[PDB]
């Protein structure tokens, strides 16, 4: 006769990170589920990191497009750290177009309905001329884990045009997880615990949805021990 | 002076923290030393040596 | 080096740790106590060994 | 499977005659037919030689005997 | 940068040459990953020959040990600079500090 | 071309085949030992710690 | 292609005699080796519903630092031997048992009264050895259905009364298992290599075999998670 926890609340302490709470738990399941969920949530979550970039007037990722104060390579890193959410398809082609002195926020990307940018203060590159212009096509797709360019670069032989720069994917929303087990509060009974998870995030994945998908994964895995 | 600076921060005086093992999730015995050390790469690379 | 340290730490005894002087029925449940965390890794104890 | 040759050395006291007897038997297996006398577990001819030695059913005496027999035949 | 240095980074990185130490302190007129174009303050200028200063950075090129020697503008447009001061991070320089 | 048959071939030609490892300033007759191989990713020879 | 993992294909169940089993699963996704190993380890080893001896009261003993002639063992050694006993209980919650016996010779577990529903698993076990005509042993052993592992940690004074002198306490080991030690070793699929291979290795005191051991652990955890998904 055990008990079973629930999701007593999802305290949204900020735009990025929140604090889910589980209650109640038995003596020990606190640390058990805590560690299991931390390890899952860090490993396996669906992200939407950028995969391929194509600036219009650049051959390879080492030149300097005239008029913008950052190497194409540093522009490319600042893209690698982009954070975006897609719902319908598994891949989309965002488009950036900009001209004139001033920064280039991420919000300048066209806002196709199925795509939600999540941080319009994010800066790609600084333009530094009146009549200077950049325009790029950015391919963003689903994924899981970490997938370098050196792996995909051997994943298809059909020719790739000269000009498609390949960023490394970082398909992962969670950034930092912690948990504390502490004293619970239930019907006239002590020796029950409350697990308090705390998850940093790009902002893409809802906390409750994250914790629920992690639980689903782990139940799917245990569907193999329960039968031998 | 280092003790005084750490204590200006919210960090423990000894400079040693308790750490939790990533695998089993259970505490380490006997707090360990953490900090930020400035590390360097060296042009003796495996794909130039193999 | 690491293993000799691990052993020198695994086979020693402080005076008053957890599980002081409780009798155990064999190396198996000695391991089981240490793993469940009810007795510090090294507190002296009477065990039946064969 | 094979890790240590200590039993083979126990049944051939030299630990060099081990190399010689085992190599000769292994050539018998690898070059000219002559299926082994122990259920091979996809171990190679070398391990099979050392293994038959551990079973004590091969040594320089038996090799000389059976070579002489077949050559007369 | 290194969190814990010994202050000699400044002298080493400024006098190693890899960076582009500005000569006549002025106001930055134009920044660009290729060149940097500085307007000179007035009292630091010759009667004739007035003009302005131009620093042509050296983009990706080869060292003698095959590492990539490179430079990057660190000052942003419309910004004072003074005599004897950095403008371009060399290889392994952060704001004019020797960051290996 | 490293077509994907050679890796199975290579497992079968390794299984029970010792290789000699050596360390540069060899001094005493333990400076050369044998080992059976185990294929690894990466590019570094791995070595048991008790050796 | 995004919620589509690997599941353990081959399941070795290679078992030594009847309680020292050894299970291997492969391949597990990179980094589930430890998560499943640790989850099942902690569950099996701290929370498994079992039945075990809790307290014992000898006829003519008042304290651990005493004795009773005829018995080549000691109070302490028989308390160990009774930790080692392994009982399974039917619908009874807790239950008392009696262990009267006299006679020159050993005393085994079969010499215990059986008392209907209660069942012993090792009739072959050993408790104490007797050597004298008039010497005898008369203890009231007590088993209880519990949910973990409970030492005798500061309990002679825990209960807010004085238990009558003679109430010897025994470290209760309820859970069946006696040893679980996962491992992790690299397993490979025809392309990938960074994968995992779980090797559970397990013994149980006898009341139930490793199979239902792991099945129950998986089920407990599966329900705790059935909460969410």
Curated annotation (Swiss-Prot), chain A:
The N-terminal domain is essential for RNAP assembly and basal transcription, whereas the C-terminal domain is involved in interaction with transcriptional regulators (such as CRP) and with upstream promoter elements. The chain holds residues 7 to 234 of 329 of the full protein. (Microbial infection) ADP-ribosylated on both alpha subunits by the phage T4 protein ModA. ADP-ribosylated on only one of the alpha subunits by the phage T4 protein Alt. This is DNA-directed RNA polymerase subunit alpha. Keywords: Acetylation, ADP-ribosylation, DNA-directed RNA polymerase, Nucleotidyltransferase, Transcription, Transferase. Residues 1-228 are annotated as: Alpha N-terminal domain (alpha-NTD). GO terms for biological process: bacterial-type flagellum assembly; bacterial-type flagellum-dependent cell motility; cell motility; cellular response to cell envelope stress; DNA-templated transcription initiation; intracellular iron ion homeostasis; nitrate assimilation; regulation of DNA-templated transcription elongation. Residues 156-159 are annotated as: Required for interaction with Crp at class II promoters. It comes from Escherichia coli (strain K12). DNA-dependent RNA polymerase (RNAP) catalyzes the transcription of DNA into RNA using the four ribonucleoside triphosphates as substrates. This subunit plays an important role in subunit assembly since its dimerization is the first step in the sequential assembly of subunits to form the holoenzyme. The gene is rpoA. Belongs to the RNA polymerase alpha chain family. Its EC number is 2.7.7.6. The keyword Nucleotide-binding does not apply.
From Swiss-Prot, chain B:
Co-administration of salinamide and rifampicin or salinamide and myxopyronin suppresses the emergence of resistance to both antibiotics. Disulfide bonds: none annotated. The modification N6-acetyllysine is found at residue 7. Acetylated on several lysine residues in the presence of glucose. The RNAP catalytic core consists of 2 alpha, 1 beta, 1 beta' and 1 omega subunit. When a sigma factor is associated with the core the holoenzyme is formed, which can initiate transcription. The rRNA transcription and antitermination complex (rrnTAC) consists of RNAP, NusA, NusB, NusE (rpsJ), NusG, SubB, ribosomal protein S4, DNA and precursor rRNA; S4 is more flexible than other subunits. In pull-down experiments interacts with CedA. (Microbial infection) Interacts (via flap domain) with Escherichia phage lambda antitermination protein Q; this interaction renders bacterial RNAP resistant to transcription pausing and allows it to read through termination signals. Belongs to the RNA polymerase beta chain family. DNA-dependent RNA polymerase (RNAP) catalyzes the transcription of DNA into RNA using the four ribonucleoside triphosphates as substrates. Resistance to the antibiotics salinamide A, salinamide B, rifampicin, streptolydigin, CBR703, myxopyronin, and lipiarmycin can result from mutations in this protein. The gene is rpoB.
UniProtKB/Swiss-Prot annotation, chain C:
This is DNA-directed RNA polymerase subunit beta'. DNA-dependent RNA polymerase (RNAP) catalyzes the transcription of DNA into RNA using the four ribonucleoside triphosphates as substrates. Resistance to the antibiotics salinamide A, salinamide B, rifampicin, streptolydigin, CBR703, myxopyronin, and lipiarmycin can result from mutations in this protein. It comes from Escherichia coli (strain K12). The lineage of its organism: Bacteria, Pseudomonadati, Pseudomonadota, Gammaproteobacteria, Enterobacterales. The RNAP catalytic core consists of 2 alpha, 1 beta, 1 beta' and 1 omega subunit. When a sigma factor is associated with the core the holoenzyme is formed, which can initiate transcription. The rRNA transcription and antitermination complex (rrnTAC) consists of RNAP, NusA, NusB, NusE (rpsJ), NusG, SubB, ribosomal protein S4, DNA and precursor rRNA; S4 is more flexible than other subunits. The gene is rpoC. Belongs to the RNA polymerase beta' chain family. Acetylated on several lysine residues in the presence of glucose. Co-administration of salinamide and rifampicin or salinamide and myxopyronin suppresses the emergence of resistance to both antibiotics. The chain holds residues 504 to 553 of 1407 of the full protein. Changing residue 1 to P: Resistant to antibiotics salinamide A and B.
UniProtKB/Swiss-Prot annotation, chain E:
Co-administration of salinamide and rifampicin or salinamide and myxopyronin suppresses the emergence of resistance to both antibiotics. Acetylated on several lysine residues in the presence of glucose. It comes from the Bacteria. Belongs to the RNA polymerase beta chain family. DNA-dependent RNA polymerase (RNAP) catalyzes the transcription of DNA into RNA using the four ribonucleoside triphosphates as substrates. The RNAP catalytic core consists of 2 alpha, 1 beta, 1 beta' and 1 omega subunit. When a sigma factor is associated with the core the holoenzyme is formed, which can initiate transcription. The rRNA transcription and antitermination complex (rrnTAC) consists of RNAP, NusA, NusB, NusE (rpsJ), NusG, SubB, ribosomal protein S4, DNA and precursor rRNA; S4 is more flexible than other subunits. In pull-down experiments interacts with CedA. (Microbial infection) Interacts (via flap domain) with Escherichia phage lambda antitermination protein Q; this interaction renders bacterial RNAP resistant to transcription pausing and allows it to read through termination signals. This is DNA-directed RNA polymerase subunit beta. It comes from Escherichia coli (strain K12). The lineage of its organism: Bacteria, Pseudomonadati, Pseudomonadota, Gammaproteobacteria, Enterobacterales. The chain holds residues 697 to 796 of 1342 of the full protein.
């Amino acid at each position: 006769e055990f008990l079973k926890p629930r999701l007593v609340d999802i305290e949204q302490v900020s735009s990025t990170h929140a604090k889910v709470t589980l209650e109640p738990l038995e003596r020990g399941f606190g640390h058990t589920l805590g560690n299991a969920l931390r390890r899952i949530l860090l490993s396996s979550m669906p992200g939407c990191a950028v995969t391929e970039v194509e600036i219009d007037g650049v051959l390879h990722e080492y030149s300097t497009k005239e008029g913008v104060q950052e190497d194409i390579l540093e522009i490319l890193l600042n893209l690698k750290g982009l954070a975006v959410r897609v719902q319908g398809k598994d891949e989309v082609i965002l488009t950036l177009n900009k001209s004139g002195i001033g920064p280039v926020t991420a919000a300048d990307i066209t806002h196709d309905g199925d795509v939600e940018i999540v941080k319009p203060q994010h800066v790609i590159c600084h333009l530094t001329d009146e009549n200077a212009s950049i325009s790029m096509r950015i391919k963003v797709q689903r994924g899981r884990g970490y997938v370098p360019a050196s792996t995909r670069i051997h994943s298809e032989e059909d020719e790739r045009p000269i000009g498609r720069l390949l960023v490394d994917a970082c398909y992962s929303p969670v950034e930092r997880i912690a948990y504390n087990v502490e004293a619970a509060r239930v019907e006239q009974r002590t020796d029950l615990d409350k697990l308090v998870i705390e998850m940093e995030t790009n902002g893409t994945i809802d906390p409750e949805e994250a914790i629920r998908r992690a639980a689903t994964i782990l139940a799917e895995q245990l569907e193999a021990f329960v039968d031998l | 002076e280092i003790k005084e600076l750490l204590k200006l921060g919210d960090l423990p005086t000894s400079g040693q923290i308790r750490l939790y093992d990533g695998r089993t999730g259970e505490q380490f015995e006997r707090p360990v030393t953490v900090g930020y050390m400035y590390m360097l790469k060296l042009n003796h690379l495996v794909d130039d040596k193999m | 080096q690491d293993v000799v340290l691990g052993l020198y730490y695994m086979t020693r005894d402080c005076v008053n740790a957890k599980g002081e002087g409780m009798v155990l029925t064999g190396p198996k449940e000695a391991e089981r106590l240490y793993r469940s965390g009810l007795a510090s890794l090294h507190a002296r104890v009477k065990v039946r060994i064969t | 499977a094979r890790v240590t040759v200590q039993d083979a050395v126990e049944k051939i006291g030299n630990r060099f005659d081990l190399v010689l007897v085992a190599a000769r038997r292994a050539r018998q297996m690898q070059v000219g037919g002559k299926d082994p006398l122990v259920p091979e577990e996809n171990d190679k001819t070398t391990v099979i030689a050392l293994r038959e030695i551990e079973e004590g059913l091969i040594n320089n005496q038996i090799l000389d005997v059976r070579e002489r027999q077949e050559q007369q035949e | 940068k290194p969190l814990v240095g010994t202050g000699m980074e400044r002298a080493v990185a400024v006098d190693s040459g890899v960076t582009a130490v500005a000569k006549r302190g002025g106001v930055v007129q134009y920044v660009d990953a290729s060149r940097i174009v500085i307007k000179v303050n007035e009292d630091e200028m010759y009667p004739g020959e007035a003009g302005i200063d131009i620093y042509n950075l050296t983009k990706y090129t080869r060292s003698n040990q095959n590492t990539c020697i490179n430079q990057m503008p660190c000052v942003s447009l419309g910004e004072p600079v003074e005599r004897g001061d950095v403008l371009a991070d060399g290889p392994s320089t952060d704001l004019g500090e020797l960051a290996l | 071309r490293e077509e994907a048959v050679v890796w199975d071939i290579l497992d079968e030609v390794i299984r029970e085949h010792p290789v000699l490892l050596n360390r540069a300033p060899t001094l005493h007759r333990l400076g050369i030992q044998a080992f059976e191989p185990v294929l690894i990713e990466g590019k570094a020879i791995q070595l048991h710690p008790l050796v």
